[PDB]
Amino acid sequence: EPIHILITGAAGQIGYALTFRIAKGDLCGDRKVVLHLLEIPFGMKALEGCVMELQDCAFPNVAGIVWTDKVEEAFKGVDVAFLVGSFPRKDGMDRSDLLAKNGGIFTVQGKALNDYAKPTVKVLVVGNPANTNCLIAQASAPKLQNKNWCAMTRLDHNRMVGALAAKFGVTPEKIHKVCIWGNHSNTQVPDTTHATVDTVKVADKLPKEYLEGEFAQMIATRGGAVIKMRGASSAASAANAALTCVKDWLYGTDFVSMAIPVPDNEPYGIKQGTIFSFPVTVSKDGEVHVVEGLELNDWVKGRLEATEKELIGEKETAWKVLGLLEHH
Amino acid sequence: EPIHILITGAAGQIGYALTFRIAKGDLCGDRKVVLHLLEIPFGMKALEGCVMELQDCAFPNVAGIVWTDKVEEAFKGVDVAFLVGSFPRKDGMDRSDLLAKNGGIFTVQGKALNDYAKPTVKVLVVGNPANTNCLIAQASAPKLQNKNWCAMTRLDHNRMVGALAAKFGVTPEKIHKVCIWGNHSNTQVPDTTHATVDTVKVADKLPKEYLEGEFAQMIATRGGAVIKMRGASSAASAANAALTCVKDWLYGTDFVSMAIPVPDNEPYGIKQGTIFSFPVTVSKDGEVHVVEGLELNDWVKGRLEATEKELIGEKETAWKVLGLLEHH
Asked: Any coiled-coil ranges, and where (chains A, B) (predicted)?
């Protein structure tokens, strides 16, 4: 009965921030966890040190610890996978250079999940490019359906809640119905046209130029802004984003943002074949449902074409440098 | 009614790990917190970035945020102070060099607490040398009693619980009555002669040479071991140590380890005038009580003389480089 939860790139800043929250029992309440920790050989020494810290925390909620560089051992029997680790974008690197390196990582992990993980596993891809990476993993796992998969857009989601909370001078508990559409970055759509605040609708309380201009642009650049100030990745906020994304994913929910494989229904004319972020509700059985009947203005719609265009374009590059054919 | 909680050195690794736990509501449950964050001018840019992350977490439990380099603004009205920040030991530095630099920091903060903080504030000193630093702060605050003060030994405490948990193959919830005596490091006494495990006493289940030799020496060197592996300070485990130390300090408790000003009672012949770590119970009113009637063997007692000797010696050096007289 204890739940097996995997974190890749576990000795890094994001993984390190997430391990201890999960281990404390923040993700699964009073249910004991068997924490799975994966690192590349360069990180095994640091991972070991992280594991030492975990013991030094003395969490009763921790049933066990699997820490390894072997993916069969790391991915075996897990119910939740936080695919945090990835190949970081470096200087002089094309997107196709990025997609090539991450493609190899996530085709391996996609199949690792498929063979070793539970058929009922929930995979949250965090490593960039999340959406396209998640698509690589999904395409490597023939046994797994698409309910198993999700890329994270919850950080930009909470960045919206937090920012709107502070604008209205209200606690974040009283901002509802925000969402991110599309890709996790570059073209993510900060949609504030359904949002409310404790209760008047955010839309007819703040200017359209603000919400769909300055505000939107702040969301898009928030990640880099934090990095510039701290000189480090948005570790704690992201780890919180991923934890709560999976929290709701497991136990239900207004609505939240999740980058999921586009359903056969193809809501809002978003073409199937990419990992696309939607405003979604989640049932208490952990079933994700896209919020289907919304009024999108010419800004939101035009922003959707921009982000889907990027997703489809990026996946086309992934197939290109992965040497893939139609039936792949 | 929201509680004002201060963290010094807030943009550092320990402070950063602690801010988000406190903000989530881990320390004070469902009570809203007003997080106070202090940094030196070199850290104000990073602190600002940390504060950005905090917004991006969207914690409803967070009532407000004071982040500053001004100590009057940082220390005003606070109920809990995590004195994390300090002057780090560098190469070519004497202990008197260390005590000189930290002396200035903590005499300022000791008086900052005195003037600006609540009279009922609880101060947990984390920055090295914790015990002696706490004594500097205490000696600068004439209005404050000694119930206001504590240095942290909870990390080595939990390092014992965690290590004994794993040895007996039991969850850490089922190890009781361990304690650290004396100074927070160098001469801390890992006392396992009252310890139990779910129920036989740890003492008559593991060898005396182990518990009071190899085991003791592992505790003493655990901090450095973690650092050597991770290439970084034991951030998460410490932040957890401090949070739970204050947790119990506020809401009560077997017993825990706390470095407190030696009571007038002078338990175990430990002379008053230092900040000494004891096995303590804590009442539900947050009143700390030293566990007074214990059987100490010749190892424990000899280890107490060694650690008190260090505390008294270190405080004598602090007075020396602070240019202090008898009435100080």
From this structure: none
Supply φ then ψ for residue A175, to 5 degrees.
Answer: -120, 130
Cβ-based burial of B191 (10 A; exposed 0-12, middle 13-18, buried ≥19): buried
What are the distances in angstroms from CA B151 to CA A192, B131, B182? 47, 5, 10
**Of B14, B55, B178, which to mutate for an interface test with A (greatest number of A Cβ within 10 Å)?**
B55
- Please tell me whether residues B168 and B142 are part of one structural domain: no
The parent domain of residue A238 ranges over 152-328
Q: Do A89 and A170 reside in the same domain of the chain?
A: no
CB A49, CB B226: distance < 8 Å: yes
Q: Do A56 and B172 touch (CB under 8 A)?
A: no
Distance CA B173, CA B175 (A): 6
In terms of domains, do A50 and A159 share one?
A: no
Statement to judge: residues B248 and B286 lie in one domain: yes
Tokens read off for B21: 């736990």
Structural domain total, chain A: 2
Judging contacts by C-beta atoms under 8 Å, the chain A residues touching residue B166 are 55
Give me the amino acid identity at A191: D
Q: Which residues of B touch A16 (CB under 8 A)?
A: 236
Write down which residue in B131, B151, B171 finishes a domain: B151
How close B34 gets to chain A, by Cα (Å)? 12
Candidates B75, B53, B95; CA nearest to B7 is B75
> Is there a binding annotation on residue B162?
no
Q: Which chain B residues contact residue A232 at CB under 8 A? A: 49
A-chain residue closest to B33, CA distance? A171
B325 Cβ under 8 Å from any chain A Cβ: no
DSSP secondary structure of A8-47: TTTTSHHHHHHHHHHHHTTTTTTS-EEEEEE--GGGHHHH
Is A327 an active-site residue? no
Nearest to A37 by CA among A1, A79, A81: A81
CATH code for the domain in which residue B167 is found: 3.90.110.10
